[PDB]
Amino acid sequence: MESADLRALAKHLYDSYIKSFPLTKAKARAILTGKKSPFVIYDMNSLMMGEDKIKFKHITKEVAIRIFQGCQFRSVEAVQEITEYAKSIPGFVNLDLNDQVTLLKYGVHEIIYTMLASLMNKDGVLISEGQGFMTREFLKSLRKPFGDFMEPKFEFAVKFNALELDDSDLAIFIAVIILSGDRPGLLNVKPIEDIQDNLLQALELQLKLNHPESSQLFAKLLQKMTDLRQIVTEHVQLLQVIKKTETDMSLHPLLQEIYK
Amino acid sequence: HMESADLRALAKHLYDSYIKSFPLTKAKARAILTGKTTDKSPFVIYDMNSLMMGEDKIKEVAIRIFQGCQFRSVEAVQEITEYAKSIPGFVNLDLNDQVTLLKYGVHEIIYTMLASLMNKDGVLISEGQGFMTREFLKSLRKPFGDFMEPKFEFAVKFNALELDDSDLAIFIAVIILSGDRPGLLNVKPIEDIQDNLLQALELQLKLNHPESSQLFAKLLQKMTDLRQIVTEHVQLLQVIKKTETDMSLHPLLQEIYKD
Ligand SMILES: O=C(O)c1ccc(-c2nn(C(=O)c3c(Cl)cccc3C(F)(F)F)c3cccc(Cl)c23)c(OCc2ccccc2)c1
């Protein structure tokens, strides 16, 4: 593609990314740096006040279970936001419908983890559209396997945030993830990889212009897709352990279906 | 950041060392595999009897073969270790980090280079004098049948990138100098080296495959496929250690797999 076309693709994706995701990384960074203070959850009692004063709809049973399930609720919300964003990626909706479903099915976890880093620092994570802040330490100290469920996310985020990407960078990176041609069961790989090459071209030029001093940032960001795949695999295995161990997890059958 | 002429110098250096360190190059392997040559033709092993005739021309069957791969993996580690010492800056790192970069890097490199010896139907063995079919491996008993097929599945996809040896010399280097390995003491000097290696690989791929659009990015995404195969392999080994009480690993391989 010609350079002026890549910038156009980058601008298109940035605009769409702003419309699809309410809490941007720029905004999140303002809140975390202390630059209306969020409600802070750092222990059990502040949690009990947090739901009462600000209605957390992911957390309206044991506390560590409540919190785990609340993360499920929000992940379901995020999936719909990512699905709307993907439709704005040039070429996506023209793909075979089964392939569109397949790309989203296997991609959303990688994107959720990526975008969750925009809401985290080394000390905690923004929640409920940025009105709250849950500390890392409180999450880490949740009992039995739930404590060891949240920390891998922080560990990735700390490393990922060291790249210092902004929203215009992330908009293209997110697009690149969705258009992965190696997803199982794809019917027509060719147009998927063709779009990804254009997106990779766009991301490469974006990083060079926006971070001229950051040598081989393109390569370094692509290496992070190894960290994502591995963390997604780990996550899936942790779920299986909870399903086979915890007698206290069942929800309403309808809710179980929603969270399948 | 480096100058273009400096990066070409680094690529030539690494290609030269790779030729010195690895006796069975991809160019040679493909000449043997593509045939048409009466002097380089391998003996083909596809079943029990030809395996038995193979020993003339070049315990239980699956163990013998598994032990054969263990032996060759040890040799490969020795070759990779020698190559790594030639990577500018590697020998100047903290010794513990040198050991750590090799601990986690050798397998990812072994599977990369094993692809050079593979096609969809089998793999070259014994310095290219032999060829073991995929199906014969897949038909070995117990957990051994399922041991090589993941590698074949990777190689088919990886070989579709059509890299040659001069490309692989830099890619192998980029893998070793990974700053995200667990337990590294000084990540920064490792990452500075990798930046120059990545710069070198980027320019090398552009010059050597000018029509192969975004080959650089596509090659880096393959480093994800490598990580998954190493995990899968290590889990299979653990199963055998708990099932075959009489079976033994090389000290070198034994230490590599500790964590
Ligand atoms: O605003 C957002 O975009 C967003 C994105 C991700 C998370 C989040 N997800 N998550 C997972 O376990 C997870 C992941 Cl990574 C990916 C896929 C599926 C899941 C899940 F298993 F939950 F189904 C977390 C684990 C630890 C910490 C967090 Cl913050 C998460 C999120 O939590 C909001 C929240 C947290 C606690 C209580 C109430 C709400 C918000």
Side-chain angles (χ1 to χ4, degrees), chain A residues 1-10 12-18 20-26 28-34 37-51 56-57 60 62-121 123-128 130-143 145-158 160-196 198-207 209-219 221-229 231-236 238-239 241-242 245-246 248-250 252-259, chain B residues 1-2 4-11 13-35 37-48 50-51 54 58-69 71-94 96-102 104-126 128-134 136-137 139-141 143-145 147-156 158-205 207-217 219-227 229-234 236-237 239-240 244 247-257 259:
Chain A
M1 276 212 290
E2 215 78 48
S3 88
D5 286 339
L6 294 159
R7 301 309 302 146
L9 176 58
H12 177 81
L13 291 172
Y14 176 72
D15 293 332
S16 171
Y17 171 96
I18 282 316
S20 293
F21 300 107
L23 182 50
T24 72
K25 183 185 195 190
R29 291 296 131 185
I31 296 163
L32 293 160
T33 57
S37 271
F39 191 95
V40 177
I41 305 206
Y42 53 90
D43 69 349
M44 215 56 45
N45 277 287
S46 47
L47 174 70
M48 237 188 86
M49 171 150 128
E51 44 212 355
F56 310 150
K57 225 140 64 180
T60 84
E62 186 203 330
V63 159
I65 289 166
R66 284 273 290 317
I67 294 182
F68 171 83
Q69 300 183 323
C71 293
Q72 281 160 233
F73 177 98
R74 171 54 196 149
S75 286
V76 164
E77 275 188 317
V79 166
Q80 287 321 130
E81 296 164 5
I82 295 159
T83 300
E84 196 57 9
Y85 177 68
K87 289 159 186 223
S88 75
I89 304 167
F92 183 80
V93 294
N94 300 322
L95 301 168
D96 180 287
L97 285 207
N98 296 115
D99 278 357
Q100 293 181 43
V101 162
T102 287
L103 293 167
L104 294 178
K105 169 157 184 72
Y106 289 100
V108 281
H109 283 278
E110 288 161 24
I111 297 167
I112 288 167
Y113 267 87
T114 305
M115 287 188 82
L116 182 58
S118 295
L119 317 182
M120 299 177 136
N121 61 23
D123 302 308
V125 57
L126 295 176
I127 62 162
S128 34
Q131 327 289 348
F133 177 79
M134 182 153 309
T135 67
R136 181 174 194 172
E137 152 60 22
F138 177 59
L139 288 167
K140 202 165 82 164
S141 66
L142 285 180
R143 60 84 164 163
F146 291 102
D148 306 335
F149 200 84
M150 318 287 176
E151 186 64 6
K153 269 64 140 188
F154 286 107
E155 288 169 323
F156 167 82
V158 150
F160 188 81
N161 286 349
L163 297 181
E164 304 195 327
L165 307 182
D166 60 42
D167 289 298
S168 67
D169 302 321
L170 287 159
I172 314 178
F173 183 58
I174 288 308
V176 167
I177 292 178
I178 294 167
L179 282 293
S180 296
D182 54 337
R183 306 298 185 188
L186 288 172
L187 292 175
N188 190 2
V189 171
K190 172 181 168 60
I192 295 164
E193 272 170 11
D194 299 330
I195 296 166
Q196 205 192 51
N198 278 261
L199 290 169
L200 286 162
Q201 264 174 279
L203 172 62
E204 189 186 6
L205 178 64
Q206 167 70 14
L207 295 181
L209 294 158
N210 194 38
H211 307 276
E213 90 287 356
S214 189
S215 188
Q216 293 295 305
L217 182 57
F218 183 62
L221 179 51
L222 297 181
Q223 294 188 102
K224 288 289 147 325
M225 260 180 295
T226 295
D227 289 329
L228 280 176
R229 299 261 186 125
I231 211 170
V232 173
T233 53
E234 276 174 36
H235 175 92
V236 171
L238 252 183
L239 289 186
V241 170
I242 284 149
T245 288
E246 298 291 313
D248 198 15
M249 320 286 302
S250 60
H252 189 294
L254 276 193
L255 261 192
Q256 306 215 335
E257 272 299 336
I258 299 168
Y259 299 165
Chain B
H1 196 291
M2 255 164 80
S4 176
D6 283 303
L7 294 165
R8 302 308 291 144
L10 181 51
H13 167 76
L14 293 168
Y15 184 32
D16 182 60
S17 311
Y18 170 109
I19 297 297
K20 288 163 181 171
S21 298
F22 303 105
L24 190 49
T25 206
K26 179 173 188 180
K28 174 144 154 59
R30 287 309 132 174
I32 292 164
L33 284 176
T34 282
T37 52
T38 54
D39 63 289
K40 324 203 165 81
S41 275
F43 187 96
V44 172
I45 292 161
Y46 60 102
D47 72 352
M48 184 65 224
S50 46
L51 176 68
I58 311 154
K59 337 177 225 182
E60 182 204 330
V61 81
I63 306 274
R64 295 230 308 288
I65 292 181
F66 188 80
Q67 302 278 23
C69 298
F71 164 92
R72 171 56 201 152
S73 280
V74 169
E75 239 172 73
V77 169
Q78 290 179 349
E79 294 168 6
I80 294 160
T81 304
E82 182 192 295
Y83 178 68
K85 301 206 310 198
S86 81
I87 299 179
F90 180 82
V91 289
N92 307 114
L93 299 166
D94 186 288
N96 298 108
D97 283 348
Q98 289 179 41
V99 166
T100 290
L101 294 175
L102 284 181
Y104 287 87
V106 282
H107 277 110
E108 293 174 10
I109 290 172
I110 277 167
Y111 299 140
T112 299
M113 293 189 337
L114 182 67
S116 306
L117 319 190
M118 277 180 164
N119 61 31
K120 74 201 198 26
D121 290 315
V123 58
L124 293 176
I125 65 172
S126 150
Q129 294 160 279
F131 181 82
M132 201 164 279
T133 72
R134 186 170 184 175
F136 176 54
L137 291 153
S139 65
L140 293 174
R141 61 84 154 172
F144 297 100
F147 231 77
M148 291 292 308
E149 186 65 11
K151 289 76 154 156
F152 281 112
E153 296 180 338
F154 170 76
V156 155
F158 190 83
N159 287 350
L161 299 183
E162 288 161 44
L163 306 187
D164 61 40
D165 288 304
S166 60
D167 304 318
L168 293 160
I170 312 169
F171 183 63
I172 297 298
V174 165
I175 292 172
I176 295 174
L177 275 284
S178 293
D180 47 289
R181 305 299 196 181
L184 284 175
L185 305 166
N186 302 356
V187 168
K188 162 86 156 123
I190 296 177
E191 298 189 346
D192 275 4
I193 296 180
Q194 203 186 233
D195 264 42
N196 297 112
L197 294 175
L198 289 162
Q199 264 178 98
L201 179 57
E202 188 181 21
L203 181 62
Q204 165 69 11
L205 295 180
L207 295 177
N208 197 31
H209 306 272
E211 285 300 281
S212 186
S213 193
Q214 292 286 310
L215 178 55
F216 181 64
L219 183 46
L220 300 178
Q221 296 198 279
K222 290 291 178 279
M223 255 181 299
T224 294
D225 302 40
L226 280 174
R227 200 73 66 90
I229 310 199
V230 168
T231 284
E232 205 194 335
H233 178 85
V234 176
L236 281 172
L237 285 165
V239 159
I240 289 131
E244 305 289 304
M247 213 203 113
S248 51
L249 295 79
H250 197 287
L252 192 34
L253 293 177
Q254 186 86 48
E255 188 47 59
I256 282 162
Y257 291 122
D259 313 81

